[PDB]
From a paper:
The spliceosome, a multi-megadalton ribonucleoprotein (RNP) complex, catalyzes nuclear pre-mRNA splicing, where introns are removed and exons are ligated together. Highly dynamic RNA–RNA and RNP networks form the active site of the spliceosome through a series of compositional and conformational rearrangements driven by RNA helicases, providing the necessary flexibility and accuracy of the splicing process. To ensure fidelity, the spliceosome needs to recognize and discard suboptimal pre-mRNA substrates while it assembles, is activated and eventually catalyzes the pre-mRNA splicing. Here, we provide high-resolution cryo-EM structures of such so far undetected spliceosomal intermediates that contain suboptimal splicing substrates, isolated via the RNA helicase DHX15 from the thermophilic eukaryote Chaetomium thermophilum (C. thermophilum or ct).
One state corresponds to the ILS complex, while the other two complexes represent aberrant spliceosomal assembly states stalled prior to step I catalysis and subjected to quality control. We have thus termed them quality control complexes B*Q1 and B*Q2, as they represent Bact complexes that have been intercepted by quality control while on their way to B*. The absence of U2 SF3 A and SF3 B proteins, the Retention and Splicing (RES) protein complex and Bact proteins RNF113A and CWC27, indicate that the spliceosomes have passed the Bact state and have been catalytically activated by the combined action of PRP2 and AQR helicases. As C complex proteins such as YJU2 or CWC25 or C* specific proteins are largely absent (except for SDE2, see below), and the pre-mRNA contains an intact 5′ss and has thus not yet undergone first step catalytic cleavage, we conclude that the isolated spliceosomes have been intercepted/stalled at a catalytically activated B* assembly stage. We would like to emphasize, however, that we were able to track the RNA backbone and thus clearly see that the pre-mRNA bulges out into the active site center between the U5/5’-exon and U6 ACAGA helices. However, the U2/BS helix relocation is prevented in the ctB*Q complexes, as the 5′ss bulge prevents the accommodation of the BS-adenosine, suggesting that the suboptimal conformation of the pre-mRNA hinders further progression during the splicing reaction. Strikingly, in ctB*Q complexes, DHX35 is bound to the single-stranded BS region of U2 snRNA, comprising nucleotides G32 to A37, within the RNA binding channel of its RecA domains. This is aided by GPATCH1, which forms two key stacking interactions with the U2 snRNA (amino acid W45 with RNA base A29, and amino acid Y41 with RNA base G30), guiding the U2 snRNA into the RNA binding of DHX35. Moreover, the focus-refined density in state B*Q1 closely matches the expected shape of TFIP11. Since the DHX15–TFIP11–GCFC2 complex is known to associate with ILS spliceosomes primed for disassembly, ctB*Q2 might represent an intermediate nearing disassembly, while ctB*Q1 could represent its precursor.
Residue numbers in the entry:
A (entry chain 1): 7 to 228, 266 to 298, 343 to 383, 395 to 423
B (entry chain L): 4 to 144
C (entry chain z): 18 to 672
D (entry chain A): 1933 to 2143
E (entry chain CY): 343 to 367
F (entry chain A): 1547 to 1642
G (entry chain A): 967 to 1063
The structure:
Amino acid sequence: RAAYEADLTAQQSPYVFFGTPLPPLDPDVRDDGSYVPIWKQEARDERGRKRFHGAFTGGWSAGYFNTVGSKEGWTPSSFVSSRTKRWKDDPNKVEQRPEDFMDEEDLADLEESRKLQTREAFSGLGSTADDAVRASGLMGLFRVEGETMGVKLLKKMGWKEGQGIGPKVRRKARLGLGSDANITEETHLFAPDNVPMISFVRKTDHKGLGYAGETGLTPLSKPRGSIGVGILNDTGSDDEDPYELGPKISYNRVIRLPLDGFVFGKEPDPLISEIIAEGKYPPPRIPPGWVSSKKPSTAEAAKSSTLDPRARAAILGEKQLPGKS
Amino acid sequence: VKGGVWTNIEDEILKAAVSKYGLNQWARVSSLLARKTPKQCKARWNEWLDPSIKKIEWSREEDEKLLHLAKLMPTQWRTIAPIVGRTANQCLERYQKLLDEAEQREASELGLTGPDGGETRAPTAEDVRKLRPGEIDPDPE
Amino acid sequence: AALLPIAKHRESLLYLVETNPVTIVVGQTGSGKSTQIPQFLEKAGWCADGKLIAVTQPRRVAAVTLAIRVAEEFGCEVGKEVGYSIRFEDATSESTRIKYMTDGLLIREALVDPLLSRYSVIMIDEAHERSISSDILLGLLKKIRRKRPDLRIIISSATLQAEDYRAYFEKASETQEEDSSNDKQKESIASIISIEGRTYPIDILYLDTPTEDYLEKAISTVFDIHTNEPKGDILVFLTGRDEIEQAVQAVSERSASLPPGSEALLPLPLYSGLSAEQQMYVFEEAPENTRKVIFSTNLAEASVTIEGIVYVIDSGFVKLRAYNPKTGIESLTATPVSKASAAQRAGRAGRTKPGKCFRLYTEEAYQSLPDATVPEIQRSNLAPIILQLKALGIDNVLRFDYFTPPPAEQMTRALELLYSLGALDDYAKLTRPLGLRMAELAVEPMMAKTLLSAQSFGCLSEILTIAAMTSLDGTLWIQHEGDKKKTESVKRKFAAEEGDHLTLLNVYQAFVTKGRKEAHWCHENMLNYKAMIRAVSIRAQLKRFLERFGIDVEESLSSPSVSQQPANKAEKIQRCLTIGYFAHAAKMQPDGTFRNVSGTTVLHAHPSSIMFNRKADWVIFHEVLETKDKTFIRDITRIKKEWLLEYAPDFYKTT
Amino acid sequence: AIFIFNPRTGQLFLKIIHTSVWAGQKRLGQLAKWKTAEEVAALIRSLPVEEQPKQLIVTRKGLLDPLEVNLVDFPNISIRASELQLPFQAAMKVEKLGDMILRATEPQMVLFNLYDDWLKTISSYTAFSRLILILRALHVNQDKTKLILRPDKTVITQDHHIWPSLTDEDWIKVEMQLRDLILNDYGKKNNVNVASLTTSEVRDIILGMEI
Amino acid sequence: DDSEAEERAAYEEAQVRAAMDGLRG
Amino acid sequence: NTLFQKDRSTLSFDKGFRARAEFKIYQLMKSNPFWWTNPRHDGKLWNLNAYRTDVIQALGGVETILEHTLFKATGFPSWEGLFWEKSSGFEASMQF
Amino acid sequence: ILALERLREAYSTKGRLNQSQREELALIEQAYDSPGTTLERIKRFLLTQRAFKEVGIDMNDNYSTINPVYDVEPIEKISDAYLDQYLWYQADQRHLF
């Protein structure tokens, strides 16, 4: 029946010259790659049969058919040494690693426990873990950001955090002495301030602008650990605590007629009003006597463009960043 | 969504599954459908889709029977309905319709019926019983 | 042309472009500035010395339509004397004098002549939109004009924010403060001329109470304005495609319930990726005893103009994209409209006859709205922008004359992204031409880094094809709602289990090699034609770009040498992809959703990718976007974890 | 006096400024802030790179202006305004400190250890909290804090120490008594009940943030 | 909130009257 | 304690809860062993943690109990700092 | 709040719910999110509804006696719980018992 699925895949997906074609959409041939929820999935082993094999993974057998041995058996490798051929200075030191004594299940669980995370110098997608550090008060005043290296490379070229970017601002100061303008105003070159970011509130509803909406009601309040009762006998978590009844009680310490539903604007929009208005700019005088002085490829130049940015910015009058000196 | 208004396709699949399966097996009948529970299919069969339900305009003697039974058994509509010969919701709707029609008659010979179709006419209970935009029918079956 | 008010000030602004080095123009859209000002400059003798007039447009299709209109008004063919240049499409000639470009194409074409001696007048239209390229070109022109005062700059600030441009245009440099010893009068470098347009009076009506459903309130507004007010086509400003679909379905269902003998109502959607048939149905006038209801997105605000429109309903919302700096994902969220955007939406009604405005919010709700939109440079991924700025040679991006400075930690994320993608060293400098090779490519820098780290590992032409498919906005498949299993089957005609990029490679190879460049074959295959032959041209242009990189081209697709095994070739392609796309890595969870390497944010497969129902363990995605509530990821491709631990040793580390 | 305190190690740099700087000068607050920023920058330049600070927390917002002028050469050092009303001024109310501040005839650097010998027993967080509490209590009442810190004549302050030597339980009792004094003062000043205050309100009163 | 104070007080006399059954008489 | 709990007001609008708990047997198939007491109205009426301490002391001690078990075969140096996981990753995987 | 809290005590126990229990939990969460619409629905049901769904009947076995257990529709259970709490509170206020 391999020829039937083979030429059915050839007929349904003829132009697959890259990757692997999908199995055909038919009731006869199942879809192995399709994701069928979890409440629809079945527990199968490496061989496809529906059984378990561990004692702590829900099987009625364990090991090599209820035996702690193996089909290949065990053979103790030998060890001989003397003053002449001493073991410590031999070149082929076969070391006694904790993996000769393990099994494929042990290695599988070892790599299962070994997770993946980004390095300290690079930030990842969706990383939101600094709020607990920052929203702590005096605890967060000592724990500063651990120098993600983009901030460090901006630091090297002349940036200090707490202020924005741009050309340097020539404002004198504020000393905390109110708004005194009697200062000499000799105007040191400061750094531009940081404009804040934007954070739009999530909008899934169709509720309009300025609408408060209906407010909700809150529910009426609400050697560590133990050996479990089973993942299927946990039912509704009938056990919380035997020694006292109920949840944790939190305590205080004290004791033309317009359209229907539309109102007429009391004032017109100014922004549409300057469209037909004369504006606030008088046109130029234009005295008689002025005369127009001017009487009435890119790809090839880009190919010949040998101007590297070291020499491209030289004619642009820009100061290059300091390098390795 | 589990529930909702009943369509003609769902009604005919319900009738076909009742034909193939019977009345004591509602889980299979609901398994032919997609948006309806076994209890909802059973309620739709027992309230509308059974053709032992009288689905025409009421006769007059049915109306005196309904009014006398609503006089002797206040608000026991599941008891009144077998005796009258209709369903509980049908008997309740006809009773409320008779009450609203008598209210309209009292307004008619009282003089409250002025301009026909005007906005000053006080509506009946049927207009209030009409669903507002954003409201759920309690008896979709 | 003559009836437009712009000619009434014509010679005046000519005096300005002969006297002031920079001259900001204030004018409402529709006064004919874009159609006549380049013509006025060409007739003033500014092209007699072999010079050029540049019109920089933030919008692409608006640039094409404006160039076509100016060519039609000039009596010349498009590209002969009036031409255009947008991304990957340059229709110009040597005899061309008036040229309409994308402003981003001025940013990218600036790596030809840094002084821009090929051009004499640079005018920036729709400057009130305030795109990123507009501000970068403003800084570039300000820095160029220090060395070339003969270059003239015109700004079409349609709003009352032209004073901000003027205040930007006396601040020249800190270096000129030392030479300011003479008592000479400060000459007016920047002069703002206000050419006033004409609009018929429009009545604006607000609400006494805020609404609970602006879509249904807008539908009720349309039906009340049809039943009460006389004949006139209705335009409504909506946000998304789904709201327009629900609106047209609801008005069709209620127009089925309309009484006979009244005027029929024709619903018409206005999306960005519309087909030709729906677009020409929208642009064509209403039939006899028929009144049109155009449910439109933001296009009709600034990009396109539909005639015979009397009514316009502003929902008070517009979708906006904002790249989060801390997380690193986009967010297409429904922002409340700005004061200037709502003013333009109101003013787009009364064009042919005096209409009415029907903003769906209270009058006090039009009092705390933002005066202008959020700056586009503050809510975008700055990594291509910092890449372009270092391509021009300005590596001091901290000390750069921005129009509005981006906030201080977004470009830190951008520099982190650029360092992870090769390009930059530890000293914040563009490197030995690695960084230069990502500098000049018009691709997203992620897979430009991939294409550089392709030749050392074999396959180059296949992911060059995938690069043609990725730099492509409007999707290849024509969205056929009537076909559900047929769309899956024709998506399964070219399906690859090892990711979604290989499906695009398969459809390109089917079109080019065996399809013989035939469009009707794409018509049975439910695929578009124009954007994908544009992608063919893009692949040719990128092949030319890597020909200028000095690496020879290995085009083995034409050769029948299939002796290399295809499984190793496929894993080679996806291995190069995860060499590139290591930052956009995710792991699928048992509940069906995906999750990042940090394991914090919930990600879902986009319902257009091949792996919507397929099971995978580790994936890469081309781009992540946040919808209304779910955060989707596109172009799902299967990878391995040890590929991440091998090709990102400084980014990722195991426990 | 200019105070530069290290919270991690307890090191305190006291820059004593004499009247000779203020002789013949006008707008004394302005060049006072400038001289303070210049002295901080000079002490930073004198300190080695390993001992150079990474963050500067200023009790006054105005120091954001001159220090940035005085620390152009050090972009790796950040300056942050403190929203906490830190009672670092109340360090004049120690008798010995004000004694050599007033008797000093020249501007000079003086080294102090505000934690004394707490770091051998407790961590830097508890020592910092105790120092902040002691400074707040001194700002509230100098004599009452002196009486609480020395409840008996057997409690003798060491010559090299500023606070008298006490055991851990004695320090806990002193901390609780100073907390009671500060809470009573805050309740009397702001007309708030003392016994009804939660832990967050008590900690915010101790830290001095604007509630 | 004055109403909240009133109905929490109502809880307070409810608990006292629950505790004072027979003693009040 | 009930005079100091957080939600005394909504609990003041709760009347007739004892007869309701008596009639709960006609609504739920699960029986309530504590039908007679309401924690939000009566409070916690017993405390049995001294039972835990004295049953630890009654069995000799922690060391005798751990001598009955495979504690020394785990190689853990001290008992304090040792927590049990209720389920397993595989066991929680095979839940539905 | 009290009515929904006593409706949760049956089924807020996490895990192993049938379809009606999940519908009840969804209805209770919907009532928590939007209280006013739920209250208007309940009052409309008290004014108008006089015909109700079928009530399932089962037996609970204590091994000495068995007792009936009634299964009511969740929407009617919400209405009945609100009515029960309101009636008990108003009879406590008016000294009925």
